[PDB]
Write a protein that binds this ligand. Structure first.
Ligand SMILES: [Ca+2]
Ligand SMILES: [Ca+2]
Ligand SMILES: [Ca+2]
Ligand SMILES: [Ca+2]
Length: 413
């Protein structure tokens, strides 16, 4: 028998976890046939760290039974509870093999594929079911579902959904079906097809992805297009902007070991100052070398130490020293080093704050960060803007497209 635990979470500003499931059949990435409400992601340095774990089933929250609850009501209740939430949790007994709570089987993939086929082919197309299933499974499970779908229908799932869907919802769903590396590779290819119209997407991806992520992107890009990503970047960029993006795309940044090199932190800070604000012009290769080669924790401390020498911080110094695509690239890079979840929170705010929506940016971030740091993004967003990321999506989008984005958000804050 599973064990029931009592857990108290202090919001700061949210609960630091996401949920999936519900009585309407969303499923979840752990026990999809169980209709309960499941914890899916837990923010590692957050309010629920070392209290909740992925796969935990919520039985009760602040005196409300969560057995036989709709997903949207669970989202509402957990967000609406003030300050402190007392949960009753059901957790399966596990040993050294941590990952056994994810009991997703090959038949789960078959049943998911069958239910998606039924939704695709029913009168009017059942977009609610398609969105409910695919946004409440992991990316790995979506690969399993697509394989099972083709085995049953002799037709590719992506092709069937392209015919059944349209508009922004089609963009979201087709993006979710690709592996993380496939999605980034295809977004990079799309950005270089314009050749000067969408450097923002190239900059966003290349500046924010880690060594391991860029290694896989480079491999998958070559497999998908029979061309080296570096060669297409060179053909798409020029000047020092080309040099910066080529260096970043190699994904050969130093990884920070166990020792903080305080002497090098000070020397890098002085070198960045001497190469820019202190002198006429700019020594751009020095900026490129330091900001692409040093580890991220090292550069976080470098940028702080830089403020000891310079009247302007690193971001303001960039705006004073360089212009154009090069300036944009440096500003994005420094934000990604300083606080990557805040970087994406600001980009999400920018994509929705004004008239209409920059749907291309909103979709790309919600898809690509849904299984990386969405909870950290949500925390920074709520702390800065006062309302949740969920709230902004709710006000800027509508219909099944809105619902898909809200599922990728993982909950309200
Ligand atoms: Ca419909
Ligand atoms: Ca279509
Ligand atoms: Ca200067
Ligand atoms: Ca708007």
């Amino acid at each position: 028998m599973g064990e029931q635990f009592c857990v108290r979470i202090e919001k700061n500003p949210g609960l630091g976890f996401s949920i999936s499931g519900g009585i309407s059949g969303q499923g979840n990435p752990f026990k999809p046939s169980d209709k309960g409400i499941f914890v899916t992601r837990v923010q590692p340095d957050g309010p629920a760290s070392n209290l909740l774990q992925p796969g935990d089933k919520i039985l009760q929250a602040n005196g409300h039974s969560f057995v036989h609850m709709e997903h949207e009501k669970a989202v509402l209740l957990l967000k609406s509870f003030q300050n402190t939430v007392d949960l009753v949790i059901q957790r399966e007994l596990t040993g050294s093999a941590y990952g056994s709570v994810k009991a997703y089987t090959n038949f789960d993939a078959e049943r998911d594929a069958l239910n998606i086929e039924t939704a695709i082919k029913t009168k009017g197309v059942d977009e609610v079911t398609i969105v409910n299933i695919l946004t409440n499974r992991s990316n790995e499970q979506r690969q399993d579902i697509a394989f099972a779908y083709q085995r049953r229908t002799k037709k590719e799932l992506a092709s069937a959904l392209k015919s059944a869907l349209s508009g922004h919802l089609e963009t979201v769903i087709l993006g979710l079906l690709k592996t993380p590396a496939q999605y980034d590779a295809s977004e990079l290819k799309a950005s270089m097809k314009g050749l000067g119209t969408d450097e923002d997407s190239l900059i966003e991806i290349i500046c924010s992805r880690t060594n391991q992520e860029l290694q896989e992107i480079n491999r998958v890009y070559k497999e998908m297009y029979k061309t080296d990503l570096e060669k297409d970047i060179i053909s798409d960029t020029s000047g020092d902007f080309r040099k910066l993006m080529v260096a970043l795309a190699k994904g050969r940044r130093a990884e920070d070991g166990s020792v903080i090199d305080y002497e090098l932190i000070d020397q890098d800070a002085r070198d960045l100052y001497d190469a820019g604000v202190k002198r006429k012009g700019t020594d751009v290769p020095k900026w490129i070398s330091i900001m692409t080669e040093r580890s991220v924790p090292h550069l976080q401390k470098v940028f702080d130490r830089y403020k000891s020498y310079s009247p302007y911080d690193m971001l303001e110094s960039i705006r004073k020293e360089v212009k154009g695509d090069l300036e944009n690239a440096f500003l994005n890079l420094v934000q990604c080093i300083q606080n990557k979840p805040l970087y994406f929170a600001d980009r999400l705010y920018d994509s929705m704050k004004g008239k209409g929506t920059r749907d291309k940016v909103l979709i790309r971030i919600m898809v690509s960060r849904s299984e990386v740091d969405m909870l950290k993004i949500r925390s920074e967003f709520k702390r800065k803007y006062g309302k949740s990321l969920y709230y902004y999506i709710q006000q800027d989008t509508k219909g099944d497209y809105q619902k898909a984005l809200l599922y990728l958000c993982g909950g309200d804050d």
